[PDB]
């Protein structure tokens, strides 16, 4: 229901070791998190998690 | 009577970013429809994605409508009529100015 | 004799030497992001490397939203950028500039 | 009787006569500083101080975080808070529609110049010695004043203006000629907050970092 | 009636929308008794 959106333009950096491979209902490739993770958005000036 | 509020054609304002959301939504819909013909996805998935990639897009627009009005054009006649509770509802306003 | 709780600073002067900070404090036309500070992001994954969903098509597709929507704000921004009333980043006003002009 | 004890925050195992103290009521606390006899009751003595919850008899030693005066000093009190108007429920034919409370949070004690009386023909105030009384931390400290005015000590202390900002934490002494009218500072703060909010709203658009703020 | 009351009690702009430059560099209506 709730869709997390990107705060600003940049690169998404996260550690792929804690996330396990999956297949979305919509058929796209994806990653499932069973634990808390912190993604970083390398933007021009600031970051976001 | 002294203020004489009125609603116009140009007075109806759309969220700055609509051409981007609709464009990326239709681009994703095209990519899906291509792949469907190649066998990478099945119809149920196509059916589902279509409904969702559209519902999410629309809601971003509706939720974003109020901030735009309060931040950019505070005294917009449609915003005055909606926020005051006189006439209209958020749902009605969305249909007029969003999607 | 003066304790630490009392500080004497006669004729204290604080100003911004660089032009960007001065224009930001006063409110004059200035870019949102400091070009000095701006640093290029390292190359991201190429289109080929992305999963299919995110890959960009090789041929530029058609759309009814490819053309920008004409508004009064763009015309007024161009008219006031001429004659030197405001300064815009580039020759064409962008959407954020129009949204800001809608307020001011 | 003059009595001083350890700095531990607990009861003193007795009660004090409040007639010989100053009762400065706060939001969640109340302080008692001893008052020597005087024509005008403004002489304090920071050697004995007690803290107590509002309307209680459980006295205790407060938290002292600054060197306190060990001599009779003449000061003036000034409260620092914000009114809290609430809408109470109406269950009566003439129930009050609103309720007003002062809700003081800090109390400033400004020592007079040379311990002079208010009736003196040449009266002044010493802003370099100000003692704040916090109500949330039960602490009484000193004010880190920043004296920025040409003249030094030779300048007469009759043209001064203490400006307090940042929730009673910033003190600056400036001459009364370069003061700011209330509308000026109101507009300054409103403009700063509005610009911060506007930059936040716009930061979430893709056309950022290529735009200009006109 | 609600529209009239809202226009009455709405006020006006207060920050960047009423002043162009920062007021830190430089009077209102007279004090009405």
Curated annotation (Swiss-Prot), chain B:
Give the top-rank taxon of the lineage listed in the UniProt record for this protein. Answer: Eukaryota
User: Where does the UniProt annotation locate this protein?
Assistant: Plastid, Chloroplast
According to its UniProt record, which protein family does this protein belong to?
A: Belongs to the RNA polymerase beta' chain family. RpoC2 subfamily.
The entry's function note states:
DNA-dependent RNA polymerase catalyzes the transcription of DNA into RNA using the four ribonucleoside triphosphates as substrates.
SUBUNIT field = In plastids the minimal PEP RNA polymerase catalytic core is composed of four subunits: alpha, beta, beta', and beta''. When a (nuclear-encoded) sigma factor is associated with the core the holoenzyme is formed, which can initiate transcription.
Q: What is this protein called?
A: DNA-directed RNA polymerase subunit beta''
Q: Which organism is it from?
A: Nicotiana tabacum
Encoding gene per record: rpoC2
Q: Span of the full-length protein shown? A: 55 to 153 of 1392
